[PDB]
Amino acid sequence: PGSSVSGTFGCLGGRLTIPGTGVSLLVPNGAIPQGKFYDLYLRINKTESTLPLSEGSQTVLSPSVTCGPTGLLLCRPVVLTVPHCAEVIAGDWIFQLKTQAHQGHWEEVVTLDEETLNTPCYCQLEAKSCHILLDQLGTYVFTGESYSRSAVKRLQLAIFAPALCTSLEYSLRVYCLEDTPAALKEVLELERTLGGYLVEEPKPLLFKDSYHNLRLSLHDIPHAHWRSKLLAKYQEIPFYHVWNGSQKALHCTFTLERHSLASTEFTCKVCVRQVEGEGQIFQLHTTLTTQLGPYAFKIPLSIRQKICNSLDAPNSRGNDWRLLAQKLSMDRYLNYFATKASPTGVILDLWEARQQDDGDLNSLASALEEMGKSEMLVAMTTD
């Protein structure tokens, strides 16, 4: 219900966002035909709906996201942003954007680095998210596959305990989640129903394509007052279950027993690690959606038009939108911008999409300054 949002947009565009997920749809100025208004929606689909894409070497890297309705005319691309859990720079991944024509059926839109002049999207692949320029709306998911020993995904580790405890029985739920805000939001919602609370801030863990399992154990339990109810000294989560994705709230449950209700404080060391890989320690101690244009955008229309007019013109020594794209690290496949009526306009849309996250207006001015462009353009873009 609240994993979907909707809005009405015109040619001035705007932004649709599902709060706490990393998922948003940026509808730029001029994507919607002048004098028209579109009712659009944006939804995250069930974690389990991509299960067929999660097997052996293949993994789902992002939530599956639907934007629509389909069948509306767009004049310029829109930007669909999704978070991902890949470590991108490192070991070899084959990245792919996939689309779902109808329920239970996926096909590739593109495999990254196989782009052609006909590819109807551009995946701007960032460290922790993808900003996907789309020529059309629909259902999309970002996937990655690898046999490389070097390929890494990012996890976040979140531990929950019951807020109310009346028994001698006590339990800790140690979740091993994909590192996206969406994944955390989902588990927080699950635990609200289960009556759990987050005992510590989540912690990162890198998980390697090494075929090694996750191992989880408790240590330094106050034996005088507490005991573990499990025979095994540790628990494991199978490598493929961690690797593949599309699994709702992966966790192990640890079960403890207090001697009496006088014991109202629990302490222990929780270790979560990949065999032959990384590990984390928790030192535990418990007690018993819609913006509209042009205000949705960081660059005023007047300044955007000035930049686009300056940079759209082909430059003999390479000093045009191509160099701006290179400077902003948006140059993995320049020909997607080249076929647009304003290559600069689409680059700026991508920059806008980035600014919802980590950057600053100075990344744009810095780039323009290094390009030797008008100091008036730099003046206009500085922050």
Swiss-Prot record:
Where is the region Interaction with DCC? 167-185
Q: Where in the cell is it found?
A: Cell membrane; Membrane raft
Q: Which residues carry this modification: Phosphotyrosine?
A: Y41
Q: Where is this region: UPA domain?
A: 149-288
Tissue expression, as annotated, is:
Mainly expressed in regions of differentiating neurons. Expressed in the developing sensory ganglia that flank the spinal cord from E12, peaking at E14. Expressed in the roof plate region of the spinal cord from E14.
Describe PTMs of this protein. Phosphorylated on cytoplasmic tyrosine residues.
Give every Death domain span: 306-383
**Positions of the ZU5 domain:** 3-146
Cytoplasmic topological intervals: 1-383
Q: Which domain of life is it from?
A: Eukaryota
Spell out the coiled coil positions from the record. none
The family this protein is said to belong to? Belongs to the unc-5 family.
Q: What does this protein do?
A: Receptor for netrin required for axon guidance. Mediates axon repulsion of neuronal growth cones in the developing nervous system upon ligand binding. Axon repulsion in growth cones may be caused by its association with DCC that may trigger signaling for repulsion. Functions as a netrin receptor that negatively regulates vascular branching during angiogenesis. Mediates retraction of tip cell filopodia on endothelial growth cones in response to netrin. It also acts as a dependence receptor required for apoptosis induction when not associated with netrin ligand.
Record note on quaternary structure: Interacts with the cytoplasmic part of DCC. Interacts with GNAI2 via its cytoplasmic part. Interacts (via death domain) with DAPK1 (via death domain). Interacts (via extracellular domain) with FLRT3 (via extracellular domain); the interaction is direct. Interacts (via extracellular domain) with FLRT2 and FLRT3 (via extracellular domain), but has higher affinity for FLRT3. Identified in a complex with FLRT3 and ADGRL3; does not interact with ADGRL3 by itself.
This protein is called Netrin receptor UNC5B
What is the scientific name of the source organism?
A: Rattus norvegicus (Rat)
